[PDB]
Each structure stands twice: as structure tokens, then as C-alpha cells.
Design a protein around this ligand. Structure first.
Ligand SMILES: [Zn+2]
Ligand SMILES: [Zn+2]
Length: 78
């Protein structure tokens, strides 16, 4: 009953377990490559797993193991 070509919108669905993504869960991905999961999917990857990305193979952005920028590369030491 409208003149617009798009008068509706669907919610996102966790493509890992299949569930209703909450509002703050929409952009809740453990990785910035898009591979997004819900809370029941991330509560297991960052727990009994290496908190890594099963889609691009990367450490979730949030200090997963230790994180290292570029400390001593040759270890000068004394
Ligand atoms: Zn899920
Ligand atoms: Zn990723």
C-alpha cells in the first residue's frame, strides 16, 4: 500500500549459529573483516578457542592474546 520500492527491512541473523541479532549485536563482530557472530558464538571462540577469525584467520581486535606493535626487533640488550 505504498509507492516506494522498499517499504520494509529485515533484521540481521547470526550466520554462525542462526539467531536474532540484538541492536548492539548488529555490528558486534570479533573481527573487522565482516565475519560477525552473536554473543553465544563469540563466548565460545574467545573461550575454548584461540579467539581467532575462522573466516580470515586474524586475532579479534580487542587484545586477544597479547598484541605487539614493534618492540625490540634485534634485541640489542647489553
Ligand atoms: Zn551465533
Ligand atoms: Zn576476520
Amino acid at each position: 500500500m505504498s509507492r516506494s520500492p522498499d517499504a520494509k527491512e529485515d533484521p540481521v541473523e547470526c550466520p554462525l549459529c542462526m539467531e536474532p541479532l540484538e541492536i548492539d549485536d548488529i555490528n558486534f563482530f570479533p573481527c573487522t573483516c565482516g565475519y560477525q557472530i552473536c554473543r553465544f558464538c563469540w563466548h565460545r571462540i574467545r573461550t575454548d578457542e584461540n579467539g581467532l577469525c575462522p573466516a580470515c584467520r586474524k586475532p579479534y581486535p580487542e587484545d586477544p592474546a597479547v598484541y605487539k606493535p614493534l618492540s625490540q626487533e634485534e634485541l640489542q640488550r647489553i
